[PDB]
Every structure is written in C-alpha cells, then in structure tokens.
Amino acid sequence: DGRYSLTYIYTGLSKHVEDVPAFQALGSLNDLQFFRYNSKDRKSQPMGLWRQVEGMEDWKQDSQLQKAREDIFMETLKDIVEYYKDSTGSHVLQGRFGCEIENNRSSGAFWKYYYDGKDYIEFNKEIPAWVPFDPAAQITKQKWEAEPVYVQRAKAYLEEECPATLRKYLKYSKNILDRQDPPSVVVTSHQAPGEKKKLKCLAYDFYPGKIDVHWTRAGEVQEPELRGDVLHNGNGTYQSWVVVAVPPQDTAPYSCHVQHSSLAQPLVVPWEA
C-alpha cells in the first residue's frame, strides 16, 4: 500500500461581489480534485474521472450535508465579523480538513481555519480540544465545546469517519489513483521569422505526474530554453514539455528522452529534419 490523502477546503466571503459565490467547497484525493459545491448551485458535484464513477457517493445526499456545513461555516464567519464590529468590510474564512493513510494505516489528520489569511483556530485531537489563535476564536472555541460530546465528535471525525471515507473512496478509485499511464510523446520544431529554429518535445496523457523529459544533442544532454507542464483534472492526466533552440548551422542529431514510472525503460524519440 502507498500514501493516500483526502483533503477538503471551504471558503466563505462575508460580502461576496457579483458572480462570486459566498461559499465554495472542494475536495481532493491525492493530486486530484474529485468534487466541488458552491452556495449558488447548492449541489455537490463529482469532478474529473469521478464523473464516470458510480456508487462511490450519493451526491444528492452529500448536497444536503454541504448545505448544513455551509450554514455553520458562514455563521462562524458572521460571528467573527460581528466581534470585530466590521460588517461593512469584506472578510474571508477558509477551513481545511482531512486525513491521510499510508500502508493502509491512518498516518495524519488536520482541521484548521484561517480568517483574513491568519491562523484562526485548529483542532488538536490528542487533547482533544480546539486551540484558538485569534481573540475571536476564544468565543468560537467556547461554542464548539459547549457540551462534552462536541470534542468527542470532532476527534471521531478525524480518527474514524474521515479515514473510513477515504478507504471507501479508495475502493472505487483504484483505476484512478493507482494508474501507471505511459506517456505519448510528440517532437516538433518551429522557426521564428528571424530567430533560430526550436525543437519542442511534448510528453502527454500520462500519470502520475513525476516525469523526466530532456533533449540530447549528439548524445549530450542539453539545457532547455523553456520548460513547462500541466495537470488536466478533467482527464486526470499530465503533459510536460521542453524546448531547445538550434544553431542556424547545426546538423547534429537531436533526440528527445522520456523516463517515467510506467515505462519498463526510457523512450527515445529522435527528430528528423
């Protein structure tokens, strides 16, 4: 077994402007986002490759849960703004929570909020109790700990529920998170009217993202003039490119090299002028 992480991020705005939802939520499994929800549509929607997954989650019921989450989250923001007596201002509360497993064993958990970018309050499950960092968080803490069962529920969420949810999602996400998709490569060249000729090597449609792409000139690894990459969440694939400029009078042999975890050995793709 390897490392898997489940992370949720909530963002609330006390005075949202036109076309920006007051509350937005997203969730990621490792490097991929699997769902989103906002206060405009009010629907939890799967994303990327999870749009094709069936039976992992009942999105209609999750929608109801997120609405309840949104309500409490925004009330928390409202209370903070009230404490500072600044509702005419535009403020933001962001919360991050989730857990991780490694070798099928819980290996980490976190739950922390930030107000206007500064640490606000976080849960320490070993105590177990909330830890305030901002003066207003002392009030929030008092409310979140008004009955003995509240900290017990918070501890159970990080230690029992969240990892159970991750394990479940992993059962339906094997063909997504554990893929070893080999890269397709395409070499191409371009001539800028007046500038040198440049050779572009592109590796695409691969996963995971870790990859080694480099050009060689007569077997000599070259220094790229421009390099870049991207992750397309819709597809769950990466693309990575490298570019070199070639002397107007160079005849040497150019070849692109690609090494990736899904390949039995590296690939070489020479460029034919």
Ligand SMILES: *[C@@H]1O[C@H](CO)[C@@H](O[C@@H]2O[C@H](CO)[C@@H](O)[C@H](O)[C@H]2NC(C)=O)[C@H](O)[C@H]1NC(C)=O
């Ligand atoms: C994964 O998604 C990416 C992004 O949509 C696809 O890349 C595009 O592919 C089309 C047609 O193949 C090209 O015309 C675009 O230029 C590509 N987007 C860019 C600018 O990178 C990719 O084909 C998808 N791969 C799979 C396996 O479906």
